[PDB]
């Protein structure tokens, strides 16, 4: 009956009403205090449908301990809705609630790192760096001394972190990016190379070494790094697209097109390579390359983003708006699908359409977009809000 | 070696004589296809001469004409349509590939023309001491008319298969996809071609140390498959 | 023959090639014609291209090797267009055929073997 | 049925020149090999383990696109600073290696170029203006090049069908040339005249490789039979077979023993000359083996090309797979090892040529 009530509540909240869903949630959770998923469904429902966030998360912090997802949902809700200076206190009661040091500690450093006075956010992480954390903790520690200014100690923390945790590749990514923001740059080559000889099946670290050896000159060595990447994994779209973009960023458009053909040979149902292949064709031939892309990988967000960018590129705004709506509704978690969407709606549309496209992005906050994670990993644009991030990607196109 | 033997042959053996030595032979039919309109025309003209020669044999008078097609009349025609369906089952009863014509046609399907050179797979498996999988290997090598050996050793046991290419493709479909092995995996070590076939038939030779397995291969003039599979096995084990 | 027709399939390979092209005509995997082979090379749905060395002039299909190097598709020249045309189930000479990819069709093993064999011919 | 034919006396004076050039080279090679044998086996085996520790660390660097057409052959120059590639268009580019900047592409071919081969005295003993390169094509074409002209110097017109490969004598005065006349010619540079047209195969000849002492010249072609000619006597010295498919590459070793013929049946075969045997038939690749090149002066390993996307290092002797130099997206068409041993380049059908090096 509890599964039946959750299913009927999901159907009722999807189809018609919300207050009947509130009543069936109050009933189904007054039947028993339950697992983390049912309180989680009530909290997610109210996060879709402000004061009841405090009410339901207060009942969750009362009757459901050890459901830390409800704790972090509560702490974020008291951050955004009311304001900061008590939610940390509430997270302090999570300090009183859970000595398991996995997720609450970097949540706490998220809290005191959004604001001023980050030296407290030093010492707490110090506690965390001896508490009981997967050196995931360490990468936040490595972000700690990276966002203010990198000390030689900022090089020290990632080196000690890798001396603990050689296997984790995002630490190698942080060491390489930190050495990129140092003065010279083959130390970053040494960092990326040691990471890629130790991690070794992590595609963004290969992309980082590729973009580094493309940027400093000797593009041939960047092509060799990417071709070692395409062999050592193999058969993935993320390295094939970087090889295609490496030939297209140089003057070799023909070789970029034949590497795109070799890429779509061995991984046809992939969104990013088809979204690049639509762009690589000459402009009278994109119309059917995109149709073949829709037939190979339908319901893929990168592909519908490419079709929307096509219709905007052919200046048909009435179809491009519909295709952008379909793009963001197949997957709203992709960041570039909002980047082009706000840039299009500021190029064409009324002011309330720009209102729309910044409603629905902050509704479901994105990830995974290479322009979006290109500015979400810019540490100059790291701890800032998401409308600012969407404006920054929309200005850089 | 004091001087290599061509240098000892000349030290004088030269003059203005270029030569044409002992040419050796290197160690055809085309099928006819028809368009569908030509299939219809050929079928209809073969059938027109068939109807013409059946009516011809009626015209000579060897036999009365064939069968043309309330309980009594269609009881007659029920016996005659039983005769007709029985004659259809007679013409299917002869021309049937009785019991061993299927066997010789399955053989001439599976036994290719290996002279013109024999395609050789070499596989290594980490472990095939499983009885069912060594049975699948032995039985499918014998049944696809593939020759070879499975020498057995710890961590690298070598399956040299040697037959026609249509059997080699079926054996690599078996060995790499159909036999579900599992840390124990099978790889394709080599897939080449040699002049003619070396081994006798698929016989599971075995020695637990490497030197006698290389000696058993060297009996056949095929030690290079062993040295290759052993060396890439120990190189995978180090890497 | 024409020296620019390269690679050229010998008699055993062209017998296998014309039987595979005939089977692809039966399985509806075959696109006859140099324009249809150009189309299925551009759409990237072509398994492999056969061509005819006795096409006069040859250059009306010699763009197809270049397309087969920009799409990573195996290409091979049959000896004469009449045999290739009959191998497509048409009485007219056909100078360029595209055996194309289909959804898991039963010729994929024969097509893969012929692909591996005619990428050995260009040497 | 060895038929004999009278040749011109240009052939006779050229053969006495090849004799008096090759015999001191062979004596010096045998004495240096005798001095290499007399040092203790600890030093030799430690040196080969040194070299194998280097060769297992052959990583790819500077992979560079050659053309919009697949490259067919690379040949390292002496001085190892240039690298002549041979695209399937007419162009025969020359990259400044290890930097891989282009240097003065050579136009003047029309059909698919086969090999372009540097002179053995190109950088070291040959001025830039004098003939330095020699390319060959899929029509009847062999043509010599300089390093500063970009349109060739006097071609070779003795051919009517596809010339497969070209290789120089280690002199440089002679230019072996496999044709598809089921024969190979031997052009000469002093007389500027084709001195020799050796027919010894039943089908077309693909690759020629000269002995580094200069005495011998192995060939081997689409008849699956490799020959070993003496230049001095005509007289195919060691007929070699056991391949059933088309031999696509010969190379002679800098120690005078071995010949590794790589063939179309995915093998490679290391033959002796002091035994006339097939010493070891390396089961090299999954597809056919085009480029086979030993190391230069010391000659300690064996690099095989492939029409799968790989190229492999085998120790020599012993023939265990030191390193697969994989990474290409197409078939590896031709390769060469630099004359210092430090650098290895393989062209491919991926339109790229690469460089592999010790780390």
PDB file of N, CA and C in Angstrom, chain A residues 223 247 252 255, chain D residues 63-72 85-89 91-95 102 105 347-348 350-354:
ATOM      1  N   UNK A 223      47.992  15.691 -31.415  1.00  0.00           N
ATOM      2  CA  UNK A 223      47.347  14.639 -32.192  1.00  0.00           C
ATOM      3  C   UNK A 223      47.832  13.264 -31.758  1.00  0.00           C
ATOM      4  N   UNK A 247      41.525  18.588 -35.486  1.00  0.00           N
ATOM      5  CA  UNK A 247      41.797  18.849 -36.898  1.00  0.00           C
ATOM      6  C   UNK A 247      40.988  20.029 -37.419  1.00  0.00           C
ATOM      7  N   UNK A 252      42.873  21.824 -41.235  1.00  0.00           N
ATOM      8  CA  UNK A 252      42.594  20.563 -41.916  1.00  0.00           C
ATOM      9  C   UNK A 252      41.127  20.198 -41.718  1.00  0.00           C
ATOM     10  N   UNK A 255      40.485  16.525 -43.202  1.00  0.00           N
ATOM     11  CA  UNK A 255      40.920  15.465 -42.304  1.00  0.00           C
ATOM     12  C   UNK A 255      40.022  15.405 -41.083  1.00  0.00           C
TER      13      UNK A 255
ATOM     14  N   UNK D  63      52.529  12.717 -34.368  1.00  0.00           N
ATOM     15  CA  UNK D  63      51.766  12.164 -35.478  1.00  0.00           C
ATOM     16  C   UNK D  63      51.179  13.289 -36.310  1.00  0.00           C
ATOM     17  N   UNK D  64      51.527  13.342 -37.591  1.00  0.00           N
ATOM     18  CA  UNK D  64      51.150  14.473 -38.420  1.00  0.00           C
ATOM     19  C   UNK D  64      50.502  14.026 -39.717  1.00  0.00           C
ATOM     20  N   UNK D  65      49.445  14.740 -40.106  1.00  0.00           N
ATOM     21  CA  UNK D  65      48.743  14.456 -41.347  1.00  0.00           C
ATOM     22  C   UNK D  65      49.641  14.754 -42.530  1.00  0.00           C
ATOM     23  N   UNK D  66      49.649  13.847 -43.499  1.00  0.00           N
ATOM     24  CA  UNK D  66      50.404  14.055 -44.712  1.00  0.00           C
ATOM     25  C   UNK D  66      49.596  14.714 -45.808  1.00  0.00           C
ATOM     26  N   UNK D  67      48.453  14.141 -46.167  1.00  0.00           N
ATOM     27  CA  UNK D  67      47.691  14.631 -47.305  1.00  0.00           C
ATOM     28  C   UNK D  67      46.213  14.373 -47.074  1.00  0.00           C
ATOM     29  N   UNK D  68      45.408  14.756 -48.059  1.00  0.00           N
ATOM     30  CA  UNK D  68      44.034  14.289 -48.147  1.00  0.00           C
ATOM     31  C   UNK D  68      43.938  12.894 -48.747  1.00  0.00           C
ATOM     32  N   UNK D  69      45.061  12.314 -49.138  1.00  0.00           N
ATOM     33  CA  UNK D  69      45.264  10.998 -49.692  1.00  0.00           C
ATOM     34  C   UNK D  69      46.148  10.184 -48.760  1.00  0.00           C
ATOM     35  N   UNK D  70      45.959   8.869 -48.702  1.00  0.00           N
ATOM     36  CA  UNK D  70      46.741   8.055 -47.771  1.00  0.00           C
ATOM     37  C   UNK D  70      48.189   7.946 -48.188  1.00  0.00           C
ATOM     38  N   UNK D  71      49.074   8.008 -47.200  1.00  0.00           N
ATOM     39  CA  UNK D  71      50.504   8.008 -47.463  1.00  0.00           C
ATOM     40  C   UNK D  71      50.938   6.564 -47.662  1.00  0.00           C
ATOM     41  N   UNK D  72      51.908   6.348 -48.546  1.00  0.00           N
ATOM     42  CA  UNK D  72      52.202   4.989 -48.970  1.00  0.00           C
ATOM     43  C   UNK D  72      53.549   4.514 -48.460  1.00  0.00           C
ATOM     44  N   UNK D  85      57.884  11.349 -47.166  1.00  0.00           N
ATOM     45  CA  UNK D  85      56.653  10.591 -47.281  1.00  0.00           C
ATOM     46  C   UNK D  85      56.197  10.564 -48.729  1.00  0.00           C
ATOM     47  N   UNK D  86      55.275   9.653 -49.028  1.00  0.00           N
ATOM     48  CA  UNK D  86      54.849   9.437 -50.407  1.00  0.00           C
ATOM     49  C   UNK D  86      53.339   9.244 -50.398  1.00  0.00           C
ATOM     50  N   UNK D  87      52.614  10.291 -50.744  1.00  0.00           N
ATOM     51  CA  UNK D  87      51.172  10.227 -50.666  1.00  0.00           C
ATOM     52  C   UNK D  87      50.619   9.512 -51.889  1.00  0.00           C
ATOM     53  N   UNK D  88      49.344   9.154 -51.830  1.00  0.00           N
ATOM     54  CA  UNK D  88      48.720   8.545 -52.993  1.00  0.00           C
ATOM     55  C   UNK D  88      48.266   9.561 -54.021  1.00  0.00           C
ATOM     56  N   UNK D  89      48.415  10.848 -53.743  1.00  0.00           N
ATOM     57  CA  UNK D  89      48.373  11.864 -54.782  1.00  0.00           C
ATOM     58  C   UNK D  89      49.757  11.942 -55.416  1.00  0.00           C
ATOM     59  N   UNK D  91      52.027  14.064 -54.612  1.00  0.00           N
ATOM     60  CA  UNK D  91      52.960  14.810 -53.786  1.00  0.00           C
ATOM     61  C   UNK D  91      53.846  13.877 -52.976  1.00  0.00           C
ATOM     62  N   UNK D  92      55.099  14.287 -52.807  1.00  0.00           N
ATOM     63  CA  UNK D  92      56.100  13.522 -52.064  1.00  0.00           C
ATOM     64  C   UNK D  92      56.713  14.490 -51.061  1.00  0.00           C
ATOM     65  N   UNK D  93      56.058  14.654 -49.926  1.00  0.00           N
ATOM     66  CA  UNK D  93      56.462  15.684 -48.988  1.00  0.00           C
ATOM     67  C   UNK D  93      57.695  15.250 -48.204  1.00  0.00           C
ATOM     68  N   UNK D  94      58.378  16.229 -47.618  1.00  0.00           N
ATOM     69  CA  UNK D  94      59.607  16.001 -46.859  1.00  0.00           C
ATOM     70  C   UNK D  94      59.512  16.743 -45.536  1.00  0.00           C
ATOM     71  N   UNK D  95      59.338  16.020 -44.446  1.00  0.00           N
ATOM     72  CA  UNK D  95      59.129  16.677 -43.173  1.00  0.00           C
ATOM     73  C   UNK D  95      60.424  16.726 -42.375  1.00  0.00           C
ATOM     74  N   UNK D 102      56.755  20.881 -42.413  1.00  0.00           N
ATOM     75  CA  UNK D 102      56.895  20.524 -43.817  1.00  0.00           C
ATOM     76  C   UNK D 102      58.064  21.274 -44.441  1.00  0.00           C
ATOM     77  N   UNK D 105      57.383  20.254 -50.523  1.00  0.00           N
ATOM     78  CA  UNK D 105      56.724  19.128 -51.183  1.00  0.00           C
ATOM     79  C   UNK D 105      57.170  18.978 -52.627  1.00  0.00           C
ATOM     80  N   UNK D 347      54.214   5.441 -41.936  1.00  0.00           N
ATOM     81  CA  UNK D 347      53.064   6.005 -42.626  1.00  0.00           C
ATOM     82  C   UNK D 347      51.860   5.084 -42.518  1.00  0.00           C
ATOM     83  N   UNK D 348      50.708   5.583 -42.954  1.00  0.00           N
ATOM     84  CA  UNK D 348      49.508   4.771 -42.889  1.00  0.00           C
ATOM     85  C   UNK D 348      48.467   5.225 -43.895  1.00  0.00           C
ATOM     86  N   UNK D 350      45.643   6.147 -42.753  1.00  0.00           N
ATOM     87  CA  UNK D 350      44.985   7.145 -41.921  1.00  0.00           C
ATOM     88  C   UNK D 350      45.352   8.572 -42.339  1.00  0.00           C
ATOM     89  N   UNK D 351      46.132   8.706 -43.416  1.00  0.00           N
ATOM     90  CA  UNK D 351      46.757   9.903 -43.975  1.00  0.00           C
ATOM     91  C   UNK D 351      47.821  10.485 -43.067  1.00  0.00           C
ATOM     92  N   UNK D 352      48.185   9.814 -41.987  1.00  0.00           N
ATOM     93  CA  UNK D 352      49.167  10.336 -41.059  1.00  0.00           C
ATOM     94  C   UNK D 352      50.474   9.583 -41.202  1.00  0.00           C
ATOM     95  N   UNK D 353      51.544  10.230 -40.776  1.00  0.00           N
ATOM     96  CA  UNK D 353      52.784   9.541 -40.482  1.00  0.00           C
ATOM     97  C   UNK D 353      53.104   9.904 -39.048  1.00  0.00           C
ATOM     98  N   UNK D 354      53.694   8.986 -38.308  1.00  0.00           N
ATOM     99  CA  UNK D 354      53.979   9.244 -36.914  1.00  0.00           C
ATOM    100  C   UNK D 354      55.473   9.194 -36.657  1.00  0.00           C
TER     101      UNK D 354
END
